[PDB]
Every structure is written in C-alpha cells, then in structure tokens.
Amino acid sequence: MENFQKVEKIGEGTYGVVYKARNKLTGEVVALKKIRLVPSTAIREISLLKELNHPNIVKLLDVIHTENKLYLVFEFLHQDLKKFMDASALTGIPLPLIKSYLFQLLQGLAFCHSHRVLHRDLKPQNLLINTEGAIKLADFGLARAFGVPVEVVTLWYRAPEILLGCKYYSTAVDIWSLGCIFAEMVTRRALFPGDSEIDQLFRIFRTLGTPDEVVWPGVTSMPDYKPSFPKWARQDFSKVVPPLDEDGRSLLSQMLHYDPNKRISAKAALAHPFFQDVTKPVPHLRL
Ligand SMILES: O=c1cc(Br)cc[nH]1
C-alpha cells in the first residue's frame, strides 16, 4: 500500500499471503510476504538473514515492520520448481538440468549450513528458477525464527526424525528434503506423498524399510516411536528411481539414510561422483 505502487496476490505461503509488488521509490518488482500473526524475538533473528547472500539463495531484501504488521521483501523469480515439474511432466526435466539444479541447491544448502542457518521446510514450491538456469532456495532461517506456523502443510519432504517427534533439528533435515526432491525430479512422481503424519512415516518405511536400532541407533527412544509399527522390508533404489544411474542412486542413498548423523553433508555431496559431468544448461521456461 504506502510503499508499493502495485500489489498482486501470487499465492498462500507457509506464514502468510505472498504478493508480487512494485516498489514505489525504485520501480522494482519484488515478492512481498505478509507474515500472518509482532514478536520482538523474530524481528531481530530474521533481520540477520538480510546479510545471508549467495547466488542460490533468494535474496531477503528488506524486513518491514510497520503498522504492527510484518512483511518480508524478497527478490522476485518467475517460476517455482513445483510448477516447472508440472509443466515438464510429459517429457521430464532433462537429466543435465536435474543435475545442475541439484548441484546448485547443494551449494545453497552448504552455504546456509556453514552459517548455521537451516531451512527445515524445503519443498518444490520454495525452490525458484529463472531463465538463466539458476535455481534458488527461498525461506531459509524462517522456521527457526517463527516456530509453529499459524491450506495443507505438505508433509511429503519431512525427515523421519521430525515425524518421530524429535524437537531438535539438524542440517540433515534439509538433506533429506532435497533427496526427496531429487527423486521427484527424476521419476516425475513425489517419492513419499503422505496425507497424514502416520501415512507419511509409513510411506517412508514401506520404501526404505522400518528402521531399527541397527540402522538408526537411538530410533526406538524417539518421542513418537511405537514398538507396534509394522516391520516392512527395504526396497532397492533401482526400483524406486529408475532410470537414474548408479552414481545418482548412490548419492540419493546417502541423502536418505535414516540416521540423520549418517546422511551426507551438502559439502560432501558436491564432491560425489554423480557431479563429475555437471553443467549449467538453459531451461525451457514458459512464463
Ligand atoms: O538408513 C539406511 C538403512 C539401510 Br538398511 C541402508 C542404508 N541406509
């Protein structure tokens, strides 16, 4: 309103409405996120994210706290990965572009993780793409700052430790989510499309096997673990993500280990043999 020349809804988001807007002073187009309620503890923490700049992170340009309302101003990108995968469904996203995107996303996570910032809620809708071949992660650091959010809150990319009620997060949660997204780019079908917490957890178990103390020391002491969970056998990744090659299947394995401590780091993933032949292709992007 006061500081924007024109504002347009472009979707519901995790914390509130997201608008495409034009800054009145500069004329630039930005993404403006209204945070649905302001807690003073959240304003300082999120303001720190204004300094957290990388080519694969959506730039937080401004934090605007006026009229007892909170807005986040981000750099605008024209499409998200959810929409791009839908648009790409007949053909699939080409493998070199999948590889480019995964490599770039890992660079963004490695950067944020090195600065002790987690995402905690990665999903295709928060991965934004441009016509230049870049992909960028939006909303790093918001989940820690804002806590429990006030439409459905997709569970499909949630790591098993959070589904088992651990109220501790680590960098591994983001690697899990990215592994799920990698698999979805390859197969054209969400890996674990749960529509409740237990369905989500059981979809994971039916593919990866029910975890136990051998593969995941400590699991049976997780808050929401039940000894009565069914015991499913683990499937080979060759059945789960064909026609991904053995480098891709080996990297995905390491991103989807049950024990968060065993999951590959973003920095180590960048060195995986899967990326030996990575390139940066131009996407077929219809805006
Ligand atoms: O977390 C796991 C479980 C098995 Br079995 C193999 C690899 N990773």
Calpha distance 142→117 (Å, rounded): 9
Header resolution in angstroms: 1.0
Calpha distance 109→265 (Å, rounded): 9
CB-based pocket (< 6 A), ligand 1: 209, 215, 234, 257-258
Q: How far is the CA of 29 from the centre of ligand 1 (A)?
A: 46
Residue where a domain stops, chosen among 43, 75, 107: 75
Q: How far is the CA of 195 from the centre of ligand 1 (A)?
A: 24
107 and 65 within one domain: no
Q: How is the beta sheet containing 29-34 ordered, strand by strand?
A: 4-12, 17-23, 29-34, 69-75, 60-66
Q: How far is CA 197 from the centre of its chain?
A: 18
Calpha distance 167→223 (Å, rounded): 9
Q: Which of 86, 121, 199, 245 is catalytic?
A: 121
Q: How is the beta sheet containing 135-137 ordered, strand by strand?
A: 79-80, 127-129, 135-137
Is residue 287 situated within a structural domain?
no
109 and 21 within one domain: no
Calpha distance 266→74 (Å, rounded): 24
Asked whether the beta carbons of 62 and 73 are under 8 A apart, the reply is: yes
Q: Give the determination technique.
A: X-ray
Residue where a domain stops, chosen among 44, 75, 106: 75
Look at the chain and count its residues: 287
Sign of CA dihedral 42, 48, 49, 50: positive
Nearest CA to ligand 1 atom 3: 215
Calpha distance 81→2 (Å, rounded): 32
The total number of structural domains in the chain stands at: 2
**What is the enclosing helix (H) or strand (E) of 127?**
strand 127-129
What range does the domain containing 30 cover? 4-75
How far CA 185 is from CA of 65, 70, 167, 190, 248, in Å, comes to 38, 34, 29, 8, 12
Which among 215, 235, 236, 250 is the best mutation to test ligand 1's pocket, defined by most ligand atoms within 8 Å of the CB? 215
Bridge-based pairing state of the strands 69-75 and 60-66: antiparallel
What tokens does 250 get?
Answer: 């080996």
Residue where a domain stops, chosen among 15, 49, 75: 75
3-state secondary structure of 14: coil
Which residues, 6 or more positions from 91, have their beta carbon under 8 angstroms from its beta carbon? none
Calpha distance 214→209 (Å, rounded): 12
Phi, then psi, of 77 in degrees rounded to 5: -125, 150
Q: Which atom of ligand 1 is nearest to the CA of 259?
A: 1
83 and 66 within one domain: no
Residue 284 identity: H
98 and 29 within one domain: no
Calpha distance 140→143 (Å, rounded): 8
Calpha distance 148→133 (Å, rounded): 34
Calpha distance 257→255 (Å, rounded): 6
Instruction: Supply the angle between the helices 246-255 and 172-187 in degrees, to the nearest 10.
Output: 150
What tokens does 186 get?
Answer: 């390859």
Binding residues for ATP: 10-18, 33, 75-77, 80, 123-126, 139
Calpha distance 111→116 (Å, rounded): 9
29 and 132 within one domain: no
| Angle at CA of residue 144, ends 60 and 51, nearest 5° | 30
Phi, then psi, of 224 in degrees rounded to 5: -105, 10
Exposed e or buried b per residue across 115-135, where buried means at least 16 C-beta atoms within 10 angstroms of its C-beta: eebbbbbbbbbbbbbbeebbb
Calpha distance 90→87 (Å, rounded): 8
Residue 118 identity: L
Q: Which atom of ligand 1 is nearest to the CA of 234?
A: 5
| Angle at CA of residue 196, ends 194 and 199, nearest 5° | 55
Q: How far is the CA of 102 from the centre of ligand 1 (A)?
A: 22
Q: How far is the CA of 24 from the centre of ligand 1 (A)?
A: 54
**Active site (annotated) includes residue 121:** yes
In CATH, what number is assigned to the domain containing residue 36?
3.30.200.20
Residue numbers after which the chain is interrupted (C to N above 2.5 A) read 37, 150
185 and 94 within one domain: yes
63 and 103 within one domain: no
Calpha distance 110→116 (Å, rounded): 10
The 3-class SS string of 132-150 reads CCCEEECCCCHHHHHCCCC
